[PDB]
Design a protein around this ligand. Structure first.
Ligand code: NA
Length: 129
């Protein structure tokens, strides 16, 4: 599913992401836009052989099991395919684990490079929330 901007903001809010560990909703929407262009089916392979899955591009080296990333962990305890669902619950629940891991949202390279230190509230302007 390809979300609309406000539709995704609402979904994320309902799933407890607004101000989760101090990151306002616009941060999460901004990261999703640049990670996946709001497409839950997004996948991208990394140089190390791991793959990133879903709306928030969660990596198989640490966070999910895809059956093809040798020596990897599955810290969210989920098949990576669950991250591709139109239902964002598994992505959100795993993202909450990731953002709590030490480095905050810096874990998402696109957040650091394209969202951090920008007016992220712009991503939710106009939405009914
Ligand atoms: Na893995």
């Amino acid at each position: 599913k390809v979300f609309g901007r406000c539709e995704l903001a609402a979904a994320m809010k309902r799933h407890g992401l607004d101000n989760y560990r101090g990151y306002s909703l616009g941060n999460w929407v901004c990261a999703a836009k640049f990670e996946s262009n709001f497409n839950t089916q997004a996948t991208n392979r990394n140089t190390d052989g791991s793959t990133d899955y879903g709306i928030l591009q969660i990596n198989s080296r640490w966070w999910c099991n895809d059956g093809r990333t040798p020596g990897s962990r599955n810290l969210c305890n989920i098949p990576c395919s669950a991250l591709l669902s139109s239902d964002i619950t598994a992505s959100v629940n795993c993202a909450k684990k990731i953002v709590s891991d030490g480095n905050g949202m810096n874990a998402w390279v696109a957040w650091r490079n394209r969202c951090k230190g920008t007016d992220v509230q712009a991503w939710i302007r106009g939405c009914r929330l």
